[PDB]
Amino acid sequence: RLFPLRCLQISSFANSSWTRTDGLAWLGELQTHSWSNDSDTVRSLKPWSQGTFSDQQWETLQHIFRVYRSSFTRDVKEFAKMLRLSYPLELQVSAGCEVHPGNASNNFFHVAFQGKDILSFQGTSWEPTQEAPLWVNLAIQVLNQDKWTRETVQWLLNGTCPQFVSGLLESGKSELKKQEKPVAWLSSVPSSAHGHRQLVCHVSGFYPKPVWVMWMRGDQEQQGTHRGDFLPNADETWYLQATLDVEAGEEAGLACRVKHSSLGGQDIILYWS
């Protein structure tokens, strides 16, 4: 039951002429905000996206981000020119925080260049990753001597974000704790080994994410059950499949059992054919 706030930024520079900067905000697994290069403001995707913040508070934040995007693009382009860095440039920012039961909180600010970690904001100052291009330190000593940037980032991460997240959790409590019942169906695919079959148990439309899926014969669990990756549905639910390798003819008697918090204490048991 953890709901950290992830604020993501994708900034692409193709050439001196062409640049995009877009952003997202996730609370847990749900996207609460969207930020487009075309838009002058950050769009709220949920009724509770603003949390308990007033309009004045949200306008203050809106101003900062608007100024931030302009300067960031200007700073990077000039900094690249000074170092003779070759376009294209791909920059990513991951920042936010997490609220803990004891009124305590932890935050993070991470920047990546061309897919690799370069620097991050720890405490009151910026610090490089152990493997980073030597020129990263040039950017850092500049960023550290910037009082406005240094203090505003702290104010956002430590001062604002924890209060913001607390507001989101209270205002959006009904939707965050929602229960969505899974739906299962069975399928079979020819195995790599001749004279065999692979059974596929599909589970889709469920939330929250934790789920239990196992192939079973009677009350005995099949150990050969192979769980797959969680694949997102676009309706904000999860999709998952489980596979079992069995010899042809051994299919009968097998069932797929599914345990989930939304099922009211009763497992979904799906028999073959």
Partner: single-chain antibody, 228 residues
Framework: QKVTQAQSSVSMPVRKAVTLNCLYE???????IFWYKQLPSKEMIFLIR?????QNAKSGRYSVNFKKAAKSVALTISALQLEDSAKYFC?????????????????FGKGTRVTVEPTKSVIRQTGSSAEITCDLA??????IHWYLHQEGKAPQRLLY??????????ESGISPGKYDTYGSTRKNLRMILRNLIENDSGVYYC???????????FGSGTKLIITD
């Protein structure tokens, strides 16, 4: 009031310590606090700077006790000398959403006279005009600021000259036509006062932000006496 110095006057013996109180009001999360010293010559001298995110500032005999919660920043002079007799001003630099531009005004308290117990003067007649000349070597030719100090009141910025737009930017409430500038970023720059009244009497400073360290440098004040 944005900056409050409650003590109007303080007298202290030589070789002892004095503490000057200053209270400020700001809604910003990042700011500077400055302490200035006005000599009897009306020369405005920078003493010490207190950052909002920094620890208590200590320079020479000057020390700052910074309480961020109470928004209380108090200067303390350690061993008072005879040359320490002056009017001390508490000042607050605020930022904008763009950070701390060199267009930033400095907000003054009304000041506190400290008495330790053991420049050009111009006179004009009502209806005439006057030219205040600015002598400043360094640091920043980018924006030249003009401040006015009248006794009983806190020093106010009248305007500043933008050398990037080559224009004058007047503070809110000041009627155009009263003040204007003529010259380049070089010391030839002067401020013209038109249609002088008796309330125009005071000390006029030219000021710029320093390049190396961030502080407001004030030039030698010009004393303007106006008679009816």
């Amino acid at each position: 009031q944005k900056v409050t110095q409650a003590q109007s006057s303080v007298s202290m013996p030589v070789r002892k310590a004095v503490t000057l109180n200053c209270l400020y009001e700001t809604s910003w999360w990042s700011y500077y606090i400055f302490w200035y010293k006005q000599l009897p010559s009306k020369e405005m001298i920078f003493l010490i700077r207190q950052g909002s995110d920094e620890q208590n500032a200590k320079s020479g005999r000057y020390s700052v006790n910074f309480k961020k919660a109470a928004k209380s920043v108090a200067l303390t002079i350690s061993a008072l000398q005879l040359e320490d007799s002056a009017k001390y001003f508490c000042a607050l630099g605020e930022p904008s959403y763009w950070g701390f531009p060199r267009t930033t005004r400095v907000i003054f308290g009304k000041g506190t006279r400290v008495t330790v117990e053991p420049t050009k003067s111009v006179i004009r007649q009502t209806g005439s005009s006057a030219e205040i000349t600015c002598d400043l070597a360094e640091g920043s030719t980018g924006y030249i600021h003009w401040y006015l100090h009248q006794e009983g009141k806190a020093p106010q910025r009248l305007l500043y000259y933008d050398s990037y737009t080559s224009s004058v930017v007047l503070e809110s409430g000041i009627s155009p036509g009263k003040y204007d500038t003529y010259g380049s970023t070089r010391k030839n720059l002067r401020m013209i006062l038109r249609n002088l009244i008796e309330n125009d009497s005071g000390v006029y400073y030219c000021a710029t932000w320093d390049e190396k360290y961030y502080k407001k440098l004030f030039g030698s004040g010009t004393k303007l006496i106006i008679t009816d």
